[PDB]
Structure 1
Amino acid sequence: LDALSPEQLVLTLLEAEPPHVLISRPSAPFTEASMMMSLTKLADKELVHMISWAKKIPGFVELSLFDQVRLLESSWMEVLMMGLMWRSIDHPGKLIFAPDLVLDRDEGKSVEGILEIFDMLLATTSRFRELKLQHKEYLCVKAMILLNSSMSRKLAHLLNAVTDALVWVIAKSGISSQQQSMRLANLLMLLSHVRHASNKGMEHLLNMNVVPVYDLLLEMLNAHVLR
């Protein structure tokens, strides 16, 4: 119960942060291939990392394996983009994928189409920047993205605890009540923009085949044999 209390949860997420991933640009001037290559290599590394991070969130380990895989599968692009926005929050106009990989808007034009994605990331980052998004609020929101990715007893509980944690953090700020409700709303409403950039990103990534298993999974869940 307590390991899931505002200060406890905040503490655990504070130290669950994945390790920073390093990567440096290539020799020649960026092309569409080299560009994506770097970002893919980079995205894959952080993903292996995103697993051990999820495992450290109070109780994630007790959710069925199917649900673990489900949430991570449904929310991984949003989690990446939020990690990316967060670390690019104090450097307006630039996306800090990694220390030696600090690309500004224009360089994205190396990979046809990513431009609109870069602007979405850049514009959402700005919103968090005006809000003066704090590291503690950030940690709660990232985890919330993980648990709010799809839609039980445990799941919802785990999610509401992360929610209670964020109210708590915003609460130790001193601002009145009406401004605590406002910040909560503003912060959460940016979740639509994150999800949206994720969908846009997925679509673009996909552009650059398996057997449909949607019905079968329902059948399986319905029969109750899924994991």
Structure 2
Amino acid sequence: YNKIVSHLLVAEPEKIYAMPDPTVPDSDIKALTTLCDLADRELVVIIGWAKHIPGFSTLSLADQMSLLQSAWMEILILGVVYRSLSFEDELVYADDYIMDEDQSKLAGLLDLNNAILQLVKKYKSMKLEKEEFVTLKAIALANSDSMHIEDVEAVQKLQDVLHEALQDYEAGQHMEDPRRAGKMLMTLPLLRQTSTKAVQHFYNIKLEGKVPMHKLFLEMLEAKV
């Protein structure tokens, strides 16, 4: 058993709830408000969670923030994706907020959510394990490709450390497939693609001004766009 994987499992945050307003009737704006409020709260949890990634808090505060400002949506989406693995054509944003095709349509998110489901579909083929999820989440952060990084060697060392952990996991638990680690890494492009679509989508919603969004969420949107 790999030490870094094990830490990451222990570091895995607690379940968060969307908690939509029952007094407010089902609309396209309720959904988007609900989702943005949820993302805002996830963010706080991700920022805290990143500190437990071995080597991360040893980076400069500037670099820590640069990686988080680049990778947060990837991490958010990867969480949604993992929660949705044992479901069919449905996205578990939270245990109390599962959206199907009709609900995605209403919310104006069919294109985004279909892309997230593309990601789910691929991980279901591979039978993604929780050990691999958490490690990929950490790699996504370390490999976020921020333009504003100061200590490039320290960030690359963090990438190597987390990459090695994945290689060691797959070498030990998945001998039947010598290329599984690579297969996992090859899902990261789609993760990035759908993160970017989600950021641009939720930024357009900001500009339309119909949906209230909290300070932190708006701050992390500005940074990426």
Give the structure-1-normalised TM-score: 0.84
Partner of 1:109: 105
- Partner-residue secondary structure (3-state), 2:178: helix
Q: Distance in 2 between matches of 1:154 and 1:64?
A: 10
Partner of 2:160: 160
Letter in 2 for 1:22: Y
Alpha carbons 1:35, 1:111 under 8 Å: kept: yes
Letter in 2 for 1:159: Q
1:74 is displaced (CA, Å) by 0.5
Deviation string 1:168-206 (CA, Å, 9 cap, x unpaired) is: 111112424xx322x222211111111000111111111
Letter in 2 for 1:49: V
Partner of 2:196: 199
**Structure 1 residue 144 and structure 2 residue 139: aligned?**
yes
Point out where structure 2 has 5 or more consecutive residues left out of the alignment. 147-151, 208-218
Any residues of structure 2 matched to 1:54-73 within 5 Å, and which? 54-73=50-69
Q: 2:182 aligns with which of 168, 180, 185?
A: 185
1:109 is displaced (CA, Å) by 1.6
* Bigger Cα displacement from structure 2, 75-84 vs 167-176: 167-176
Letter in 1 for 2:185: L
Q: Distance in 1 between matches of 2:124 and 2:25?
A: 31
Partner of 1:38: 34
Point out where structure 1 has 5 or more consecutive residues left out of the alignment. 1-5, 215-227
Partner of 1:24: 19
Of structures 1 and 2, the larger Rg is shown by 1
Q: 2:92 aligns with which of 80, 93, 96?
A: 96
Q: Give the fraction of aligned pairs with identical amino acids, expressed as a percent.
A: 33
* Bigger Cα displacement from structure 2, 76-85 vs 95-104: 95-104
Deviation string 1:93-128 (CA, Å, 9 cap, x unpaired) is: 11111111111122012222x110110111110100
Aligned length: 202
**Cα RMSD after superposing both structures:** 1.9
Alpha carbons 1:24, 1:100 under 8 Å: kept: yes
Letter in 2 for 1:103: M
Partner of 2:9: 14
1:23 is displaced (CA, Å) by 2.4
Letter in 1 for 2:143: N
- Partner-residue secondary structure (3-state), 2:18: coil
Q: Distance in 2 between matches of 1:98 and 1:173?
A: 29
Letter in 2 for 1:86: Y
Dislocated runs of 4+, deviation >2 Å = 23-30, 173-176
1:45 is displaced (CA, Å) by 0.6
